[PDB]
């Protein structure tokens, strides 16, 4: 039951998200047979890196570094929203909730989950990008001109402390699900059936952590505190974006992201 | 939330 639910969540988590934490840590610890990721630390290494990905993927693109990076960020975020949506629909009970509530949960859940999964791709020195084939240094990101130089920093700060807890993909699968099924999102119509799903997810999470992190009794408690922390990180990310939105006349926000940000905080 | 609704 609870062990069965943890297994089901792990399997769809693996199906919904290509680059897993296990895979990410192997790349970052050189514990991989693959070619090391190309490192990006300045103007010229960014250009070199882009040369290489011109042979892997593919209308408008700025010649200003910070805006171009932020545009690349937007498209990755859009692709994360899709993945997170397919994941949520795999959570037993979710798709049977009122549609307006489903939309609300994703609207408020999506960024919290993004910063959670981003942690997996980070260490204190930088972040993996493009499916793990590149690595952008933290310091290079801190150097970007305002207001973009401070865009990734709080996300690194979160991840450094979060990664200290050593969750693996199976823990993360349930943790994410608990976050999505929060009955205290603003504007929910039917709180009860959401809490009823979260209750069982919470139980599965507690059990999973007791079994796999036996040395850290009270890891459950510490995880629960992170879920709330994330709420304020998003809140402050959203304030940063309204600044960018108003003062950066060049770039245009992506429509899906506008949808999520609108009337949010 | 047009796009979100469609995703859902
Ligand atoms: C190199 O990254 C950057 C450098 C500078 C600036 Br300005 C913005 C970005 C990127 C970001 S922040 C963010 O939330 N996402 C979306 C995402 C969603 C889910 C996973 C797992 C990874 C990333 C990004 O791509």
DSSP A245-260: HHH--S----HHHHHH
CB–CB of A88/A176 below 8 Å? no
The answer to whether A126 and A144 are in contact (CB under 8 A) is: no
β-pairing verdict for A38-40 and A134-137: parallel
Pick from A87, A112, A148, A152 the residue to mutate for probing ligand 1's pocket: most ligand atoms within 8 Å of its CB. A152
Closest CA to A36 of A27, A45, A44: A27
How far, in whole angstroms, is CA A20 from its chain's centroid? 12
Q: Find residue A250's DSSP bridge partners.
A: none
Q: What is the CATH number of the domain that holds A18?
A: 1.10.565.10
Residue A123's H or E segment, with its range, is strand A122-123
Tell me the two tokens of residue A135. Answer: 């690595």
Number of domains in chain A: 1
Resolution (angstroms) stands at 2.1
Which of A24, A39, A73 for mutating ligand 1's site (highest number of atoms within 8 Å of CB)? A73
Order the strands of the A134-137 sheet from edge to edge. A38-40, A134-137, A126-129, A122-123
A75 marked as part of a ligand binding site:
yes
Q: How far is CA A241 from CA A74, A116, A148, A246, A258, in A?
A: 12, 19, 10, 9, 10
Tokens 């199976």 -> residue: A170
Question: What is the residue range of A41's domain?
Answer: 1-265
- How many Å apart are CA A40 and CA A50, to the nearest integer? 10
Is there a contact between B5 and A98 (Cβ–Cβ < 8 Å)? no
Tokens read off for A186: 């603003």
H or E stretch covering A219: helix A219-247
Which residue reads 């103007």 in tokens?
A43
Specify the DSSP element, H or E, that contains A136.
Answer: strand A134-137
Which whole-number Å values give the CA distances from A137 to A18, A38, A114, A141, in the listed order? 22, 11, 19, 6
């Amino acid at each position: 039951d609870l062990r069965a639910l943890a297994k089901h969540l792990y399997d769809s988590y693996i199906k919904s998200f290509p680059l897993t934490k296990a895979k990410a840590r192997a790349i970052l610890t050189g514990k991989t047979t693959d070619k090391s990721p190309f490192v990006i630390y300045d103007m010229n290494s960014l250009m070199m890196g882009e040369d290489k990905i011109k042979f892997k993927h593919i209308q408008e693109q700025s010649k200003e570094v910070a805006i171009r990076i932020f545009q690349g960020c937007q498209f990755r975020s859009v692709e994360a929203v899709q993945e997170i949506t397919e994941y949520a629909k795999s959570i037993p009970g979710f798709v049977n909730l009122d549609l307006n509530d489903q939309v609300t949960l994703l609207k408020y859940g999506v960024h919290e989950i993004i910063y959670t999964m981003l942690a997996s791709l980070m260490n204190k020195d930088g972040v993996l990008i493009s499916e793990g084939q590149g690595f952008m240094t933290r310091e290079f990101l801190k150097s970007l001109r305002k207001p973009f130089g401070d865009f990734m920093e709080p996300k690194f700060e979160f991840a450094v402390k979060f990664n200290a807890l050593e969750l693996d993909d199976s823990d993360l699968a349930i943790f994410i699900a608990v976050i999505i099924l929060s009955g205290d999102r603003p504007g929910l119509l039917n709180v009860k059936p959401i809490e009823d799903i979260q209750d069982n997810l919470l139980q599965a999470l507690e059990l999973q952590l007791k079994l796999n992190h036996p040395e850290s009794s009270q890891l459950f408690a510490k995880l629960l505190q992170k879920m709330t922390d994330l709420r304020q990180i998003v809140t402050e990310h959203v304030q940063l974006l309204q600044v960018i939105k108003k003062t950066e006349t060049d770039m245009s926000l992506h429509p899906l992201l506008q949808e999520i940000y609108k009337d949010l905080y | 939330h047009k796009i979100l609704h469609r995703l859902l």
